[PDB]
Amino acid sequence: GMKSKILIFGGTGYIGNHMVKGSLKLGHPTYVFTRPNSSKTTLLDEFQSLGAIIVKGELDEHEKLVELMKKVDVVISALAFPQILDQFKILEAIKVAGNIKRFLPSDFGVEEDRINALPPFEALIERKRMIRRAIEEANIPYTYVSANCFASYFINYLLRPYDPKDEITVYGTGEAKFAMNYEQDIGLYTIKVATDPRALNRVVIYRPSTNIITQLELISRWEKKIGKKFKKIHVPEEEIVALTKELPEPENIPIAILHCLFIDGATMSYDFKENDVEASTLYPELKFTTIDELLDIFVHDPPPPASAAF
Ligand SMILES: NC(=O)c1ccc[n+]([C@@H]2O[C@H](COP(=O)([O-])OP(=O)(O)OC[C@H]3O[C@@H](n4cnc5c(N)ncnc54)[C@H](OP(=O)(O)O)[C@@H]3O)[C@@H](O)[C@H]2O)c1
């Protein structure tokens, strides 16, 4: 009816699929753009059964993008790091069509306009910054989502719950705080803020007070849940920094990211600004799945591990 029509790029993605599902669950007409040479016919078939409109095509098809933009109201990009600057193709189409009410570029991580990282990672987040600067210069309505850590992704990475090993690797001292959110919730909240006037042209941060923790605390709570103790093996900060300088690319990128999130504590190293919007405070009918609930999920029905593309 009056629900804004949402177009999602990278919808078959690791985080993108939760945005597609959240969109449909909220009653929004949902368009999913996907490459012709897909390996997700089963995933696309699921979206289709849920009401999604599938549009196959390449980002290089400028005319197709423009005609597609004219049919929707909101555009959300969940593309991967290798495709960050390819978002300029999306932006060009948005500018030509001229009817888009809100554009959310592919951020969904650290708040790159207030944090810095080691060269391997810094170079990549500068690409996201370039997208934001272009959006602002063109006066395109937007919302920048700092989702912080994808919870299933990093619980799997840090705890390797599917590994019966007796040791656990700790990065740095393990004392740095970080916030992590369940992917399913990042998906739903992103759709909500994309049409919330309170988020128009603002930075939105997902930092629920129940999802702030340190590596050491996460391990301790996990040990209690499963009744096992691990031998904590620390990897010195100086060691991690050296690796980012010697190891090749993309091998050194994940190392740089681990330093950013778990040693420097970039997701918790700042205080909110006047115009910042913390999403957990927005909807009284909704709440972010907490860390305790997340650990319970890994005990009962753990989601598969994942590895981002670099
Ligand atoms: N905060 C965190 O913890 C965290 C963790 C991981 C990722 N991220 C962020 O989340 C965002 C998305 O990451 P992701 O892991 O979800 O992405 P992804 O699943 O790797 O990729 C998303 C989609 O990109 C499309 N795609 C892939 N290669 C392409 C190409 N060459 N040309 C055009 N389209 C292509 C694919 O869709 P089709 O096959 O349908 O074309 C794919 O499903 C990024 O901004 C990333 O940095 C954050």
Numbering used by the authors: 5 to 314
Q: Which sentences from the paper describe this structure?
A:
The basil EGS and petunia IGS are closely related to a number of other NADPH-dependent enzymes that act on phenylpropanoid-derived substrates. Structurally, the PIP-family proteins organize around an N-terminal, Rossman-fold domain, containing a core, six-stranded parallel β-sheet flanked on each face by an α-helical layer. In summary, a mechanistic scheme emerges in which binding of the coniferyl acetate substrate within the active site of EGS leads to deprotonation of the p-hydroxy group (PUSH) coupled with expulsion of acetate ion from the C1 substituent (PULL).
